[PDB]
Amino acid sequence: ENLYFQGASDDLTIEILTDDADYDLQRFDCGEEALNLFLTTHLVRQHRNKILRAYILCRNTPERQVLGYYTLCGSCFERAALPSKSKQKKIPYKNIPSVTLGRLAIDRSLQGQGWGATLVAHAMNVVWSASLAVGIHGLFVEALNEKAHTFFKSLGFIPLVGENENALFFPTKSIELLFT
């Protein structure tokens, strides 16, 4: 149909965290305090020391106000052939190489306007290019909140069945089909 995907503008850009920053992290506020302290206290130093890869959503003005962010880090999970509630009970399992979407926060002022989805689309595309280079099978996410959990589910993230009941996965095969 006359069906389009709309990404980041030049007014509000998504870019990987820079070497020299000049970002206004002091004004950012999403719902959760945890994701707020992380941004101002840990994000820049964890990115520098390559503990994670930080991508920022910012105003592209001289002040450079941060209005959202996300993090990516190589991960792995065991994929059982059937739901195995008791770990390693002769049920087949492969180790699935994935990328974990560790954090995802959007400023309250921007929430519910499609920016969370646009950042997810950005992450999916970063994972997709990397998959074709080194072999990554998807985007993993452990959703704390119920509001966060329904958000990932909506976008087509498969809720995984396991001992922990908050994990979701978006396969690379599915990302392939998004970008054709």
Ligand X SMILES: CC(=O)SCCNC(=O)CCNC(=O)[C@H](O)C(C)(C)COP(=O)(O)OP(=O)(O)OC[C@H]1O[C@@H](n2cnc3c(N)ncnc32)[C@H](O)[C@@H]1OP(=O)(O)O
Q: Site residues (CB under 6 A) for ligand X? A: 30-32, 35, 101, 103-106, 111-117, 141, 143-145, 147-148, 150-151, 154
For residue 59, what is the DSSP state?
A: -
Token duo for residue 168: 């979701």
Q: For residue 76, state whether it binds a copy of itself (rule: CB under 8 A).
A: yes
Question: Is position 135 an interface residue for a copy of itself (rule: CB under 8 A)?
Answer: yes
Tell how strand 138-142 and strand 93-106 pair up: parallel
Phi then psi for residue 89, to 5 deg, are -105, 40
Q: Which residues of 158-178 are buried (b: 16+ CB within 10 A; e: fewer)?
A: eebebeeebbbbbbbeebeee
- Residue 159 within binding range of Cl ion, rule CB under 5 A: yes
For position 18 contacting a copy of itself by CB under 8 A, the verdict is no
For Cl ion, the closer CB: 53 or 137 = 137
Whole-number Å distance between alpha carbons of 123 and 104: 10
Token code pair at residue 106: 């959007």
Dihedral of CA atoms 144, 147, 153, 156 in degrees, nearest 10, equals -110
Q: How far is the CB of 102 from ligand X (least distance, A)?
A: 6
Within 40-69, which residues bind a copy of itself (CB under 8 A)?
50-53
70 part of the interface to Mg ion, by CB under 5 A: no
Does position 140 interact with Mg ion (CB under 5 A)? The reply is no
Q: Least CB distance from residue 153 to Cl ion, whole Å? A: 8
Chain centroid to Cα 114, Å, comes to 14
Nearer to ligand X, 84 or 125 (CB): 125
3 in contact with a copy of itself (CB under 8 A): no
Backbone angles phi, psi at 117, to 5 degrees: -65, -45
Which residues sit at the interface with a copy of itself, rule CB under 8 A? 16, 50-53, 72-76, 95, 97-99, 126-127, 129-137, 172-173
